[PDB]
Design a protein around this nucleic acid. Sequence first.
RNA 1: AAACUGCGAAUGGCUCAUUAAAUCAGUUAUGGUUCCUUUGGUCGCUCGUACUUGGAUAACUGUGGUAAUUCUAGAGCUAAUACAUGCCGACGGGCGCUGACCCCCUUCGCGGGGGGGAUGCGUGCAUUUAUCAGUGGUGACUCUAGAUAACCUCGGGCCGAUCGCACGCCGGCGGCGACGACCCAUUCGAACGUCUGCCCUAUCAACUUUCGAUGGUAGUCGCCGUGCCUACCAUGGUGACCACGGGUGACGGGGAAUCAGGGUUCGAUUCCGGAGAGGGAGCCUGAGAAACGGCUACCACAUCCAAGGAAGGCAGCAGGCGCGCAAAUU
Lengths: 151, 100, 30, 205, 262
Amino acid sequence: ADIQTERAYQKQPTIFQNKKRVLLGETGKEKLPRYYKNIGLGFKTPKEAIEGTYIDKKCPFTGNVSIRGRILSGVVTKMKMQRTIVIRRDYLHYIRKYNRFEKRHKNMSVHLSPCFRDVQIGDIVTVGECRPLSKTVRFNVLKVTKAAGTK
Amino acid sequence: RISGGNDKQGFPMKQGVLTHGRVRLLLSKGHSCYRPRRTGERKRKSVRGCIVDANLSVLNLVIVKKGEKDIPGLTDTTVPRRLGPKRASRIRKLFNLSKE
Amino acid sequence: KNKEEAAEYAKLLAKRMKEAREKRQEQIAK
Amino acid sequence: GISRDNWHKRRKTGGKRKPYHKKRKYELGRPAANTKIGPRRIHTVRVRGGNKKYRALRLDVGNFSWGSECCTRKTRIIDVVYNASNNELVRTKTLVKNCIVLIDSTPYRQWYESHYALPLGRKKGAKLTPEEEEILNKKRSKKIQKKYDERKKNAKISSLLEEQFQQGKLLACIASRPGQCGRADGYVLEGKELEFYLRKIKARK
Amino acid sequence: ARGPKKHLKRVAAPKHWMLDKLTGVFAPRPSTGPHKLRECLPLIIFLRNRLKYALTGDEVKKICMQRFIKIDGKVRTDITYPAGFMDVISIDKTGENFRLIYDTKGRFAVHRITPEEAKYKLCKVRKIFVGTKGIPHLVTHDARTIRYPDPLIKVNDTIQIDLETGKITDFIKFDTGNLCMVTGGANLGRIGVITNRERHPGSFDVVHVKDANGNSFATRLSNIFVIGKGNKPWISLPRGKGIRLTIAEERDKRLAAKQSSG
RNA sequence: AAACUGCGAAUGGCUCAUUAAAUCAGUUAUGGUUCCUUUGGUCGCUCGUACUUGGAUAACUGUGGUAAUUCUAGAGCUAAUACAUGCCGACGGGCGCUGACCCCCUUCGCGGGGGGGAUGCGUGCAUUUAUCAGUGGUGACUCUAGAUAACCUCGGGCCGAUCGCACGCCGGCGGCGACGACCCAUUCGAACGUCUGCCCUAUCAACUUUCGAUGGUAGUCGCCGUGCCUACCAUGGUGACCACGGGUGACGGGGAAUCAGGGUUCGAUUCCGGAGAGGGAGCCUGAGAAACGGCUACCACAUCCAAGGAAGGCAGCAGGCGCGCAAAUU
């Protein structure tokens, strides 16, 4: 697919893609190295990140974002922006006078890289905290676990 | 040479102001008609324009070239010329002395 | 002082890497 | 004055946020440095911490790099032809980061010809003046001519860059923010990026 | 508040200074220096409250301005100078030397050391970095920078600085079986042998320490300071050897001391 | 003494108007920034008048103007760690790029090379941009260090024309300080983020999306991350788990009163954090202020005046009036 759907050229800023080509420099292939990094904390770089072609500067694996801070989990509830999803974290808040709990939830707008295709509503996502990416986004989707019902 | 003055209300004459009456300027460090009381302070002050007119309480004049006849107490007087050069280079330049 | 410190650290570094290379070679052999 | 705070912004729920303090100095903004092309005019700005920002107001020279040949040269900026953010920036000819410009190819061609024995361009196909054959052919020894011939084989230029050199101006992208550092530096467009920006410039006419 | 604060309230001061709640509104705000505000001991507190050499801050000022106090071998005339862990305070007029070392209660002790021990100190290396033509540099807990350190010295180790020259003489690695003090937290002032280190990537590592009396405790890796190689300290320990007694044992010892004394 | 210069005046003190995920508390992050000062390191690392350079200006002398102010104007001097210039060394070199030249081998059978070598250009560290390779470090860098090609701001970056004490030769050398300047080190911080938590109200049920509302791309601005602000694009974002609106005699917390176990009520108030200085707004200086015992304007109030003009900000300590049921010494 064409990765150049923007008014400006999309590229990985750390990759030089027009190193000089000559007869010896080209033998039936142009070649294009792919910048990717191994984020920490045991998270493995998805295969599509390594062998993909998308340009996403907020992607944890091939972009310019450092995963540091809280590592949370949520359930995907809305996928209707570009490269951003809304997940819902459900918890119980303890009211002490009644010695009981009440259901509460918080929505979280988190960045989803193009490396995670086939993400559905109800999927569980492990997200990691990064620097502010937009007005409301501060977490990047690190891992996707499909909801029970995969067959 | 006309070196300024004060109008009927005592406000000083400022060089750049090309009007006849008084104006209000936001003076700061490095301006005349203003001494700042703290670093970075600027004040709005009234200054008389530089053009000379018939509404000055006093006008200052500097005799640049002296005429034929001496003024009784302005040009025939003596001079004490207090103080002398303090920097070594200024001294050796005043007396045309060798570098060593 | 710069010259003396640089020379002394060069000596110490050379000795450190010699010991490291010896340990590496002896680990490889066994 | 110009404020970069967030409490004037609506909440993410759509709620309206009331102001609890007046504007702070560290939240300030400044007027844009609309860096036009012209004789060098740069204004120094005192910024937070006492440091200096170089608010360039006019520039006509930049340190642009030919990446494939690794040839960085100081070069006159002729024009600005494409701007991805706003089209009005090309109309007013404002130097900003990532704006596509036409720069002068002369220093690059001089280095190009000092690394001699490439395919013919304007070297003998557009200009045949003297005072430059003593830097093209000269009287070379065995070692020197052998080294130049060893350069010759791996010495080629993309046809797009070739016609750009023929026309006297090169397409470049400004990789520095002239309104902050005071320099309009960048790199010559090549490869697929050059094709992309040529197609974008063509589609604008 | 605009700009930095310049005052410290008496009640908001660090508790381990052991200041009253009636001898004024303010506590001496320690100057900026090699040690943190809440982990230091100002020179006025040491000279007046601890050693009783002065009864007022004016007398501390007189003592310090007569150039009688050396801190790590250098004369300090700043009465609010932040002196901290492992530092050496020399008073040559009275011919004494002290080391700033925590009690088991978490408070800097008046720990006199020999004049030959006052020639060195121990510093925990906070970071190591290569700069400016590849010269290695090391930054310790005294905010002192040492160029060309041994390529074996790493972060969390301990180095013995010669105060006269400022150069490194010896070092102790951070490893199990090594003696260490705790320099923060609940176990502050305790001494023991490192038994384990739980690595928590992206978070704080936890180090387990076993006392000389079989007691065990844990701290954060930033709260551990390697004191000696093996179970032998490289510095003289305070009266209690880092053994935190329970309240019952302390009461029993106090009662025994009362019986022996009266 | 005065004055120029440096520093502080951004702390403290007062008050609780605003403020309802705002502030604030606990937790965490800056690998997204700045940081006077202290402390430690760096500070002949640059191959291109110096046994000390220039012009002023205060204080002072003298002449003045205005009813009036911590208003100031001419004139005669004279200083610098103010201001502004600007070198000798180590400087012998050393390296990288360039290439007028000199002895030979494939049995010197064009061809293929094996080396030496003249003159020229560039060179610390900052900075800005492109490229290259892979010392030390992290959970993780597009980190650190290294290499190359160039750049290097009229408003221009550092690489000391400063000062004291003790001192001895044909002239040489040199102790201990003071002060100052880039930069690196989180010392004191500040700023902006993460997670969770806040009173009453539905006689407030849908709100936001025009003029940014949610996100994407490029930029501008900013100390930096960011719809922070622009341009283009997508149609998003929040809500009965109470969004949005309204009320609060609401600054938040530590905490206080009362209390069998639960709880109820309070917290303007000495500690921490925030905010404000009659109300708004905008700035200068500075490391740090949108400062008010700083300035500029407007709105309200208000002082002196010779009507031309000048000056103001007690929610600092006392004190006064007013207000009140309600609170002290000029």
